Design a protein around this nucleic acid. Structure first.
Lengths: 155, 78, 24, 206, 127, 98, 60
RNA sequence: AGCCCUAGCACAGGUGCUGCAUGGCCGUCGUCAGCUCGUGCCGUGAGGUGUUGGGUUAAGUCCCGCAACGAGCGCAACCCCCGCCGUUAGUUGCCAGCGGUUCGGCCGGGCACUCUAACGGGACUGCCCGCGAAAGCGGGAGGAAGGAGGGGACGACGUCUGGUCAGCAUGGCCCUUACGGCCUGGGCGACACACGUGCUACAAUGCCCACUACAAAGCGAUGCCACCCGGCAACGGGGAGCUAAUCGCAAAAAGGUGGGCCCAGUUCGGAUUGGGGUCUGCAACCCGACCCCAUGAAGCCGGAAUCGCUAGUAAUCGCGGAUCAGCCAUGCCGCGG
């Protein structure tokens, strides 16, 4: 990206909830270009959200995310001395990239042996707010602040 | 690993067979390591070429199945 | 998978046929 | 170490094959070998004529062999004499009775293989390389060409270090496909090692 | 009585014949959901109808060859649009915003020599 | 109904010299099952550009055998007029079949 | 030993198998296409001259 | 006479050395936006100007300026492949439209559609708004395609005294009862070690079995092998078809549906080894691949380092070909999901 500012690739909306955000999440789950099994897991997880809580799987998922989006993070920057971690505010595109990313990663660490379960519980756990997905989120907010001394660089 | 014949050099047996009608020879020497050993053609001592020289190998029963080059190795320091 | 000759996928990959992958 | 054959590049436009015979997948191999041994024979024992191209067509024992030259008379003699021997000399080993057309070239200073060939000849005659190049281009530029270029390889003037002396005028756009660029390549078996002569002559478009 | 369009996508081609009535859709001597059975994105193929409210007030006999299932799905999707605007040419200036009328040029790009796989380049080592 | 096939490396002088079998069996003849093109059979040749080690950098050659098909439904000798000997191929091959 | 070898590449050999191909104009053992009897080298050579009929510069 | 055999003579032969004597061809910076010439102008002169500058471009691409005005080798374009549309053509393709169907496009019937393959049309910054002196940049419609629509072929002056005398060509030098030649064996396949490139994995988004037209390039009449029978299978009998849009290699695999395994060095992984076989071939010990039984290793995602890739790309799954009796192919060149 030396030349342009890269047009954010626009996503084909969901075949169910008609939501672009959903699909995005489904992709992050996908492995070797197996979108089918990917979407099976996410949907067959939405099923687990019902059998356990009253709420619509979407509004679970949706608000589960917003709890995993970080507001600040640290990006390195050296000088004529050493490398320092300036805490930086985090732009809306990156927030989504990171939450969704983190969600799945966090999920596949869980114990239950079946993809659909893990996605579900983690989503559920992160809607409540007790997820290990949300740990990787509080940890960065905390890893800023700790470097609050350096937020006078910012570039 | 074959099953119609045993593919042993014919010029070998002629020596062996016609050495097997009262024949006691030990100076028997060959380059036919490609040739299968054959039933109870024992007792004899075939020197086999390893690529550099001939090897005085005495033939027993038990080794009847194997080929002749399995006893004249072609290298050094194993 | 692709290196166990006695699996169907080991045969497919090896490109051969037999007990564990017969041709119809 | 770059730069394609400007001819090989053009086949399908601008330049057409010197062998227009369809064959099949176990005969092609042979109608190839013959086809070639033909030109190995012509080119040896017909050099003096000055042969540019050697078209060849086939169709089950009729073979076109249209020999293009600047001085046809040396394939002939006065009446028949020689060409009579050669339509024989062809069919001599080629177990087929051959045809044998003959063509002239309205200008041998537009025949790249000749322009290159002449330049070579000068070089075994211990000539002034720099001039030969500059002459050759000048001749060809005056036979009405739109642009033209000549290269020699190295050991120029019997020297110890291999060089590469070159020259050109007008357009010689090797990157245009609609270019029509005769290319020709001569040797030069000198007393101290080989030289190498590329020749380029560009004509036109649409 | 009948309307038609040609759908294609990634070496996959769809003869698409439309009729009014009922709601059934034939594909290669099979029902839709037996051919695209348990393949989540199939229903996409009929979002043309769902746009113009043609919904299932149409029947469609569709043969299709070339590709693999999910290419065909987008191919059919193109036939459905290229057919129903050939029924009502006023059914165009509403399928523009969704763009259901574009071949989608994306196909397997060529494997190049000296790579591995088109763009995938073989592995460096330096020392 | 008469069957002739026409192969060729050259794509231009086939459709040309087999629209010659169109016309010379149209003028002197009658109804035609036109020139239909069988698919082509491409023999690829891939070769490394260099005399010595240069395993990348290669060149690409093909030998495309175009195939064209032509049949006509009046087996008369008032057609084999030109189709006797009236020839402008060069390196086309012919397969007159029954 | 390339010569005694090119005039043995032609001899009908004791045992069928020992038969091998060869550049017709190279005398070259390796990479000899069956369709031409030519080394990959002497082949790129002719194809460029034009002396190889219908052989085109492949592009796609 | 030709031609062959023995003793002689010129000569053959050499993958013997020299890529620092060379041709040719390749690699490389680098598909980088450059490298130059003619005439004029400036400078005693080497040289400079042009080609510097501002705007713009993927680009020395254009624009505007200017002692320069133009031009060549470059860039771009003319070529090929892929996208949409149109003619021409009907032993591949169908009720789309009707009658028989032993319900298989199989028989008339038909080329509309899909396709096969030749030639054309099409996109150009043309049109509307916006900024600009211009070229052009931001948009917007129309359109299959919008600003280089995507992918190729194409590699400037030249650099690395780059590579290659072992493809071939060639100056020189060197052996010429042997540095030439023929054979039979052996070796290039060695193994305390070390790196490169890969392959198969360490499993549950997974492995196993069963059943199920998704079909998009290529090859085959001393061959591809349908279909039979024997065989757990490799393969062997037998035999149909096609010089092949017609017959065969053909099963595509990932996938969908069903069942099974339940976290374990395991129904993960298939190394090693024992044995019994098949095939090609004169011949598989050194040194072949394939089948079957038994054996089942290290491996629980990898230190410091470090590689590829910006879209049908990476990732993943099969498919074919070239060489080739066979095969040590997990390599290479391609193809599609």
């Amino acid at each position: 990206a030396r030349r342009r500012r890269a047009e954010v690739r626009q996503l084909q909306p969901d075949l169910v909830y008609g939501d672009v955000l959903v699909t995005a999440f489904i992709n992050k789950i996908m492995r070797d270009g197996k979108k089918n099994l990917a979407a099976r897991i996410f949907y067959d997880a939405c099923k687990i959200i019902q059998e356990k809580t009253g709420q619509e799987p979407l509004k679970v998922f949706k608000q589960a995310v917003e709890n995993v989006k970080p507001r600040m993070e640290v990006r390195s920057r050296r000088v004529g001395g050493a490398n320092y971690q300036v805490p930086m505010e985090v732009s809306p595109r990156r927030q989504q990239s990171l939450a969704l990313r983190w969600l799945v990663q966090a999920a596949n660490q869980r114990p239950e042996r079946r993809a659909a379960v893990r996605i579900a519980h983690e989503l559920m756990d992160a809607a409540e707010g007790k997820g290990g997905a949300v740990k990787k989120k509080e940890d960065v907010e905390r890893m800023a602040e700790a470097n609050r001394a350096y937020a006078h660089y910012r570039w | 690993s074959l099953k119609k014949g045993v593919f042993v050099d014919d010029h070998l047996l002629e020596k062996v067979l016609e050495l097997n009608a009262k024949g006691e020879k030990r100076l028997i020497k060959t380059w036919s390591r490609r040739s299968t050993i054959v039933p109870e053609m024992v007792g004899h001592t075939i020197a086999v070429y390893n690529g550099k020289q001939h090897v005085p190998v005495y033939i027993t029963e038990n080794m009847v199945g194997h080929k002749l080059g399995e006893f004249a190795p072609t290298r050094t320091y194993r | 998978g692709k290196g166990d000759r006695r699996t169907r996928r080991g045969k497919i990959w090896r490109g051969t046929y037999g007990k564990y992958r017969p041709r119809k | 170490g770059n730069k394609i054959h400007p001819i090989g590049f053009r086949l399908g436009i601008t330049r057409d094959w010197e062998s227009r015979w369809y064959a099949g997948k176990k005969q092609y191999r042979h109608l190839l070998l013959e086809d070639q041994r033909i030109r190995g024979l012509l080119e040896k024992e017909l050099y003096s004529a000055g042969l540019a191209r050697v078209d060849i067509e086939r169709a089950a024992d009729n073979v076109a062999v249209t020999v293009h030259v600047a001085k046809p008379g040396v394939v002939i003699g006065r009446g028949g004499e020689r060409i009579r021997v050669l339509r024989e000399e062809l069919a001599k080993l080629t177990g087929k009775n051959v045809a044998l057309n003959v063509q002239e070239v309205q200008n041998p200073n537009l025949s790249a293989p000749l322009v290159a060939q002449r330049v070579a000849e000068q070089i075994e005659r211990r000539f002034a390389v720099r001039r030969a190049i500059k002459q050759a281009v000048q001749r060809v530029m005056e036979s009405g060409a739109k642009g033209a270029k000549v290269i020699v390889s190295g050991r120029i003037g019997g020297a110890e270090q291999a060089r590469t002396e070159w020259a050109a005028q007008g357009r010689v756009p090797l990157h245009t496909l609609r270019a029509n660029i005769d290319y020709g390549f001569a040797l030069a078996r000198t007393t101290y090692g080989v030289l190498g002569v590329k020749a380029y002559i560009f004509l036109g478009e649409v | 009585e009948q309307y038609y369009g040609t759908g294609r996508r990634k070496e996959a081609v769809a003869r698409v014949f439309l009729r009014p009535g009922n709601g059934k859709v034939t594909v290669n001597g099979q029902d839709f959901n037996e051919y695209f059975q348990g393949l989540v994105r199939a229903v996409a193929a009929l979002e043309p109808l769902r746009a113009v409210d043609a919904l299932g007030r149409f029947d469609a006999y569709i043969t299709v060859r070339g590709g693999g299932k999910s290419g065909q799905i987008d191919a059919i999707k193109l036939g459905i649009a290229r057919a129903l605007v050939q029924y009502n040419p006023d059914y165009r200036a509403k399928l523009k915003p969704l763009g259901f009328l574009t071949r989608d040029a994306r196909v397997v790009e060529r494997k190049k020599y000296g790579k591995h796989k088109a763009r995938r380049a073989p592995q460096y080592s330096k020392r | 109904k008469i069957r002739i096939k026409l192969r060729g490396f050259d794509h231009k002088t086939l459709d040309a010299s087999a629209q010659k079998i169109v016309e010379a069996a149209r003028r002197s003849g009658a109804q035609v099952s036109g020139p239909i093109p069988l698919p082509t059979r491409v023999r690829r040749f891939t070769v490394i550009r260099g005399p010595f080690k240069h395993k990348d950098s290669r060149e690409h050659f093909e030998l495309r055998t175009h195939n064209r098909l032509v049949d006509i439904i009046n087996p008369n000798r008032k057609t084999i007029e030109q189709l006797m000997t009236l020839d402008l191929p060069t390196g086309v091959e012919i397969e007159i079949k029954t | 030993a390339r010569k005694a070898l090119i005039e043995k590449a032609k001899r009908t050999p004791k045992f069928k198998v020992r038969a091998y191909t060869r550049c017709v104009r190279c005398g070259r053992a390796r990479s000899v296409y069956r369709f031409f009897g030519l080394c990959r080298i002497c082949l790129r050579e002719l194809a460029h001259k034009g002396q190889l009929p219908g052989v085109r510069k492949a592009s796609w």
